Design a binder for this molecule. Structure first.
Ligand SMILES: Nc1ncnc2c1ncn2[C@@H]1O[C@H](COP(=O)(O)OP(=O)(O)O)[C@@H](O)[C@H]1O
Ligand SMILES: [Mg+2]
Length: 535
């Protein structure tokens, strides 16, 4: 298990009660404890799953993310202050880190501690042996669900490669003097192999926290680290679905016709695509049992609901987003019936789907990308949202996050583009762009049409179809696809006139053009401009 002398080596003192490798049954009674107060509390829903509140923090806090700049990360990290693109990798001094470590370790000292040992990465050769230390039971549950649960033999000789101490209950009083964003903090020290959290309870910080570390370590060894969903067909054909938050990675990869490899984080080495996690983190806002049966069915004992509204009788109102629109539910991957096992990996991907939810209603439901359009759109990392739908009218807000996940990038986005291209070319992979977002109808395309589109991409129908070039973006779109409504296939059809579509295509194109300018500092990046939209 674990001794108090080892926890002391970390800096945590007077730990009397230690719960090493808590079981799901223990975690279950821990959360349901009637004498719990505030955010540690869990309630039982009629679906058998416990629901908790993550507190004030209902999403990640990129503004509070810091990485210690020392001789190990100085020349390798994609620093937010080196003027090479917008990122959240703000530098932190070794000195301020020690103060933060003091805060967290002291907060955890003299407390009952949960110690969850787990792996990040399905392969023994590149995975991280992470030890999570926390004082909140549902947080230990979150990481038991989301990371790879070792076997008794792996636990026997478990030597941690990284430690993440969650001091969510403590805050940083010296922040103003230290030049930080607030009293909260999500800091990382690559020299000490540690992550510290304070102020925010949100479990997503640990998840995306180790992802950022994999995003740093893997590409440096020639392995692609990707923000993508992934599944395999019965033939052995692997597909990866890149995309920003809310685009459909989890919704679409969870298809009964294919075996789920993972839903959010994967690597791509010499053998293929491997999952980093041990669970799935599904969105539950307006969740439909009919539209997403497999995900709904996964919600039961051992799944951990978050911020959803639970009525008196224990029933859940999934449509209620008053606490947050980011309602979620984590669960072990095995809660999905059709998955790859025992190990969550498979062969090289041949299909690479870039999902995007276009609030502008410009991009087409699907288009097969050229080799250059693939790189252009990868570095672009576009998606948009109807910000203000609650305050009035549409007003689409664009988001350009490099590699479809800049918030977790620890190296320059070109380092991810390169390793990805090297993997795609060796496997002969093909890339597609899917607009899981909006049309001229002002509505989002149906999940039915979108799934029918994904089938077409995977079974080769999209490749065999006759296509024509959509103007502005110069995207090859099919004239028709099996199971998909033909009208929506061409975005101009959903408007009163193609001129109305044109107006928007022009606005969105300038957004893309302005955003891509920062990559044209190299000859290769200058050449890709030809691949993007053109006025
Ligand atoms: N056509 C569509 N394709 C995918 N998701 C859709 C579609 N229409 C609506 N949605 C909703 O959009 C969200 C996509 O979420 P999810 O797959 O969890 O995003 P990601 O995993 O990329 O964050 C879900 O709430 C889903 O029900
Ligand atoms: Mg997801």
């Amino acid at each position: 298990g674990l001794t108090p002398q080892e926890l002391e080596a970390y800096g945590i003192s007077d730990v009397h009660d230690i719960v090493y490798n808590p079981s799901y049954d223990l975690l279950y009674q821990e959360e349901l404890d009637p004498s719990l107060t505030g955010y540690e509390r869990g309630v039982l829903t009629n679906l058998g799953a416990v629901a908790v509140d993550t507190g004030i923090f209902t999403g990640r806090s990129p503004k509070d993310k810091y990485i210690v700049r020392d001789d190990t990360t100085r020349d390798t990290f994609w620093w937010a202050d080196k003027g090479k693109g917008k990122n959240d990798n703000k530098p932190l001094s070794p000195e301020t880190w020690q103060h933060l470590k003091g805060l967290v370790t002291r907060q955890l000292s003299g407390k009952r501690l949960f110690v969850v040992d787990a792996f990040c990465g399905a392969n023994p050769d590149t995975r991280l042996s992470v030890r999570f230390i926390t004082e909140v039971a549902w947080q230990a549950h979150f990481v038991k669900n989301m990371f790879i649960r070792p076997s008794d033999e792996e636990l026997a000789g478990f030597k941690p490669d990284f430690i993440v101490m969650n001091g969510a209950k403590c805050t940083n009083p010296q922040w103003k003097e230290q030049g930080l964003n607030s009293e909260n903090f999500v800091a990382f020290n690559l020299t000490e192999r540690m992550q510290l959290i304070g102020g925010t309870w949100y479990g997503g910080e640990m998840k995306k926290g180790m992802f950022s570390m994999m995003n740093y370590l893997l590409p440096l060894k020639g392995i692609a680290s990707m923000h993508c969903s992934a599944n395999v067909g019965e033939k052995g054909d692997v597909a990866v679905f890149f995309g920003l938050s809310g685009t459909g990675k989890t919704t679409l990869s969870t298809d009964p016709k294919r075996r789920l490899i993972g839903d959010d984080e994967h690597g791509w080495d010499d053998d293929g695509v491997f999952n980093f996690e041990g669970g799935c983190y599904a969105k539950t806002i307006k969740l439909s049992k009919e539209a997403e049966p497999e995900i709904y069915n996964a919600i039961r004992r051992d799944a951990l609901l978050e911020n959803v509204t639970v009525r008196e009788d224990g029933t859940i109102d999934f449509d209620d987003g008053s606490k947050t629109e980011n309602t979620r539910v984590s669960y072990p991957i095995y809660h999905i019936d059709n998955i790859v096992k025992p190990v969550s990996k498979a062969g090289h991907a041949t299909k690479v789907i870039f999902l995007t939810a276009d609030a502008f209603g410009v991009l087409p439901p699907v288009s097969r990308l050229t080799a250059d359009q693939t790189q252009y759109h990868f570095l672009s990392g576009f998606t948009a949202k109807l910000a203000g739908t609650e305050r009035g009218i549409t007003e689409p807000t664009p988001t350009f996050s490099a590699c479809f996940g800049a918030a977790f990038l620890s190296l320059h986005p070109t380092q991810y583009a390169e390793v990805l291209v090297k993997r795609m070319q060796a496997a002969g992979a093909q890339a597609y762009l899917v607009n899981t977002g909006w049309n001229g109808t002002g509505k989002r395309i149906s999940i039915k049409d979108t799934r029918a589109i994904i089938d077409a991409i995977l079974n080769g129908s999209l490749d065999n179809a006759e296509t024509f070039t959509l103007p502005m973006f110069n995207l090859a779109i099919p004239t028709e696809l099996p199971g998909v409504d033909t009208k929506i296939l061409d975005p101009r059809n959903t408007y009163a006139s193609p001129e109305q579509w044109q107006e928007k295509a022009e606005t969105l194109a300038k957004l893309f053009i302005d955003n891509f300018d920062k990559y044209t500092d190299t000859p290769a990046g200058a050449a890709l401009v030809a691949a993007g939209p053109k006025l």
